[PDB]
Amino acid sequence: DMIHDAQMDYYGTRLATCSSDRSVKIFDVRNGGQILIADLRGHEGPVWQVAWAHPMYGNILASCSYDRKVIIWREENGTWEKSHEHAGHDSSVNSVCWAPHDYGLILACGSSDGAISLLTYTGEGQWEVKKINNAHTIGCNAVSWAPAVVPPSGQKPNYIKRFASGGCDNLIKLWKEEEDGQWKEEQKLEAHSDWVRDVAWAPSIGLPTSTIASCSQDGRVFIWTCDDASSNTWSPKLLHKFNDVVWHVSWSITANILAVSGGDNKVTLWKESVDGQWVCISDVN
Amino acid sequence: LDREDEVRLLKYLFTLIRAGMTEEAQRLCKRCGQAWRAATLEGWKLYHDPNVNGGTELEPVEGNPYRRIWKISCWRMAEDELFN
Amino acid sequence: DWETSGLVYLDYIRVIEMLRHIQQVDCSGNDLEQLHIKVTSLCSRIEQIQCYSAKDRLAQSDMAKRVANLSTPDPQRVPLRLLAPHIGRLPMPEDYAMDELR
Amino acid sequence: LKELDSQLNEPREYIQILERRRAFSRWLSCTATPQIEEEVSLTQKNSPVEAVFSYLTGKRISEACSLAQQSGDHRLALLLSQFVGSQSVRELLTMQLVDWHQLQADSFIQDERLRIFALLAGKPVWQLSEKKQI
Numbered sequence A: 001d002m003i004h005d006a007q008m009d010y011y012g013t014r015l016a017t018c019s020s021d022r023s024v025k026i027f028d029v030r031n032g033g034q035i036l037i038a039d040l041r042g043h044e045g046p047v048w049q050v051a052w053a054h055p056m057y058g059n060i061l062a063s064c065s066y067d068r069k070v071i072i073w074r075e076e077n078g079t080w081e082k083s084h085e086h087a088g089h090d091s092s093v094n095s096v097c098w099a100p101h102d103y104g105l106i107l108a109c110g111s112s113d114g115a116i117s118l119l120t121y122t123g124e125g126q127w128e129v130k131k132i133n134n135a136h137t138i139g140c141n142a143v144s145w146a147p148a149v150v151p152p153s154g155q156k157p158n159y160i161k162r163f164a165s166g167g168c169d170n171l172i173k174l175w176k177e178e179e180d181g182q183w184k185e186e187q188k189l190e191a192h193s194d195w196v197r198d199v200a201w202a203p204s205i206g207l208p209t210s211t212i213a214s215c216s217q218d219g220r221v222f223i224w225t226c227d228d229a230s231s232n233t234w235s236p237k238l239l240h241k242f243n244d245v246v247w248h249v250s251w252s253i254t255a256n257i258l259a260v261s262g263g264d265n266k267v268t269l270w271k272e273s274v275d276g277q278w279v280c281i282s283d284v285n
Numbered sequence B: 001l002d003r004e005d006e007v008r009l010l011k012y013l014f015t016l017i018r019a020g021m022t023e024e025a026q027r028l029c030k031r032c033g034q035a036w037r038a039a040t041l042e043g044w045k046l047y048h049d050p051n052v053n054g055g056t057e058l059e060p061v062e063g064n065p066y067r068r069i070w071k072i073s074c075w076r077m078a079e080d081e082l083f084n
Numbered sequence C: 001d002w003e004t005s006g007l008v009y010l011d012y013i014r015v016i017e018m019l020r021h022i023q024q025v026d027c028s029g030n031d032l033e034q035l036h037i038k039v040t041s042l043c044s045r046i047e048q049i050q051c052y053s054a055k056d057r058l059a060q061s062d063m064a065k066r067v068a069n070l071s072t073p074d075p076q077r078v079p080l081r082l083l084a085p086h087i088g089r090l091p092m093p094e095d096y097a098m099d100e101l102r
Numbered sequence D: 001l002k003e004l005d006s007q008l009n010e011p012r013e014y015i016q017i018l019e020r021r022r023a024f025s026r027w028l029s030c031t032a033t034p035q036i037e038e039e040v041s042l043t044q045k046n047s048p049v050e051a052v053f054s055y056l057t058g059k060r061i062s063e064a065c066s067l068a069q070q071s072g073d074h075r076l077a078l079l080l081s082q083f084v085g086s087q088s089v090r091e092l093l094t095m096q097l098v099d100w101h102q103l104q105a106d107s108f109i110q111d112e113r114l115r116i117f118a119l120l121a122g123k124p125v126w127q128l129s130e131k132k133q134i
Helices: B002-019 B022-032 B036-040 B067-079 C003-023 C030-049 C054-065 D015-036 D039-043 D048-056 D061-070 D077-081 D088-103 D111-119
Strands: A014-018 A024-030 A035-040 A050-052 A061-066 A071-076 A082-087 A096-098 A106-110 A118-120 A196-198 A211-216 A218-223 A235-241 A246-251 A256-263 A265-272 A278-283
Touching: A014 A050, A014 A061, A050 A096, A061 A096, A061 A106, A061 A246, A071 A118, A071 D111, A082 A118, A118 C054, A196 A246, A218 A256, A235 A256, A235 A265, A235 A278, A256 B036, B002 B022, B002 B036, B022 B067, B022 C030, C003 C054, C003 D061, C030 C054, D015 D039, D039 D048, D048 D061, D048 D111, D061 D077, D077 D111, D088 D111
Parallel strands: none
Antiparallel strands: A014 A024, A024 A035, A050 A061, A061 A071, A071 A082, A096 A106, A106 A118, A196 A211, A211 A218, A218 A235, A246 A256, A256 A265, A265 A278
């Protein structure tokens, strides 16, 4: 009937769709032609978000549902069997995304009972679930990692370690890591008035000014950007203010055009001008 | 502010490790309050028992047997991105 | 140092060709033991290593069974009752040759 | 017990005392296997780390090492291999337990690994009281 989130695969290949009928359909797009391949079904609740993995670790695609469980099925030799299954959450899952392509196979999924998840695959498939509780006041609703931030020998290059999450209590920013057991998040930023819907970080195209967009239920779209690297500055900029609530908010990779999806069942493309103010490009549909 | 302080401490520790002052870096981390970081950095030496190894007989046994596990954890942390 | 999957894949095709071209010759010829050891090491990852890979497990099982109807093949058995009686459907073969009491 | 080939020192009985202990251990393992074969199937559906602890009670070092390696661990397989009952590691296990008992809220170790770490210290039903198997 009504779909929730439908993200593409790699280089415009398949299109894993998710609706409210507990059906994770993986449709193929060949020269603009939509064609279904398989229908992964095995959840008691409605499917929410879905994110595909990188092509270096085969062909994995994780999808969240409302049955307090996370399914991660593979795709090889026409067999879309469910590989790993993580059910460490207490309530339903809202958002579920993966890390970078160079981070192996790390996926972060947020729950609704004030907790999250972080499945890190090892050398075989033993996902070490290291989660807890006490997150936001109502739970999580947004989960998206930031850009692949880089760190002189001749082996595996370093990056920035793993540390990313997101709540719904009018607080959505990045996080910091360390050199101990896991990571110690440190990035407090509050500028919203109601429940935060979606919050996707913008991918950096080589520049150090990393930005992060967010959308709440009040109708405002904040764009929090940093001044420099390793600086204590998280000033947010209001892009637009609508009368209705916003759903999701995606960003492009070339010009980093913000795709504001929400309001009156219409998507709008926002792009930063030379003066610094965000203006609407055109209207979708 | 705490994130910036942690980033500065990590940069100072990396600079000390590149210069060649592991003991000084461990002392600075212990004085700052990074006991876990100091314990993880001190685990680079292998296990050396004074009763088994008769060549380098010292006082107490120093080292750890999870050197490969620590190396794999460090490699995974270096592979992970978007944080510190 | 790590070259077992390719060696097993190269030895499976040769063993299948030798079995299809000669059905009376059923003797271990040095490389047979190495191929069996490689097949066992590849199947151990799906048996007990917490690795959820159905395609790789099926490929390893096929590479191991390609020479099952030629030599002795002491193993040759799919998932036991420890993980097939509670799930079923998948992994259920390589043990249908037991109609009588030996 | 009587030994076949005689040794040089016939004043201290060391081969017969070891053979009797090995026979007693093999008899105890064979007697406990009928009650450990049914408990191993139910423990695998709750936690994968309990399989090594359940298999180590039947006097099997290789079976415990394989169970620890199949669970994705690395230090447990190396720690279970030195279960002979000598020194060195006996004090190291106690030191590690005393270090983990403090820190912050006694750390957060599991119940299956704690027993395996305390069993390699020479005493499981005594020292120490923080990780006793009573």
